[PDB]
Amino acid sequence: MGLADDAPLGYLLYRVGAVLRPEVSAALSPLGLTLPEFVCLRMLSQSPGLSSAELARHASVTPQAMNTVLRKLEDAGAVARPSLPATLTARGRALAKRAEAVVRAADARVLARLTAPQQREFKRMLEKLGS
Template sequence: MVDRTVHLDSSVGYALKQAAAALRAAMDAALRPLDLTVPQYACLELLGQRPGLSTAELARGAFVTRQSMHGVLRGLEERGLLDRPASAPHGRALPTALTPAGADLLARASRAVAAVETRMLDGLTADRAARLRGDLAACVAALSPAG
């Protein structure tokens, strides 16, 4: 009989989940002084790199539901960090862009998150960090519907 039990001490998936939880906790702590959550930061970062993304695109990029992203966008807009038109220029999507205050907060948040990532990878050589990125990308590809 084949043993199909997942052994947590040797499970790659469990180690990955532990790493994700530790990263999330460290990001939460780094963003807290800026009064940002991880989904809010992700939204700002996505818009900083790709202005005009729709709510659905932002939700996918931030790994939250569309309903959750609506709340994130509303809160960021109320803080004056985003501009969204009252009506869609075409279709139903409201293109969203950072305000100058949003861009300033994003710059500070990006530095805080980069410091977390630097701390996370501190024990790895540049080659090992590159290998880790490649290995994780291969795992994502293997589990993707098209993979």
């Protein structure tokens, strides 16, 4: 998409994305999670028993990449031992919630680059463009 539209709106959106993604990744790192691992974890907390293929389609990734993500999550004891169905362990559910919290905090950290009135204005304009 950043490759697709290099005109100003698409480019500027892309650049904010390229700030937000590392912010989120950096926030997840101390929890032992990559961004794709977190996405998988969150999907499974919201939909227990989804298969790897299902997860891979919802994340728009390859079944192989999702299998890898799932293996690393099993290794961390977050995903239960088993394209197979997958579920979270107690540790996994706890981790999913802690991780969602640090991601929301990352989001706020990027937004806080703007003053409070600027944040309200900016969100209204984003909302308009996205509605």
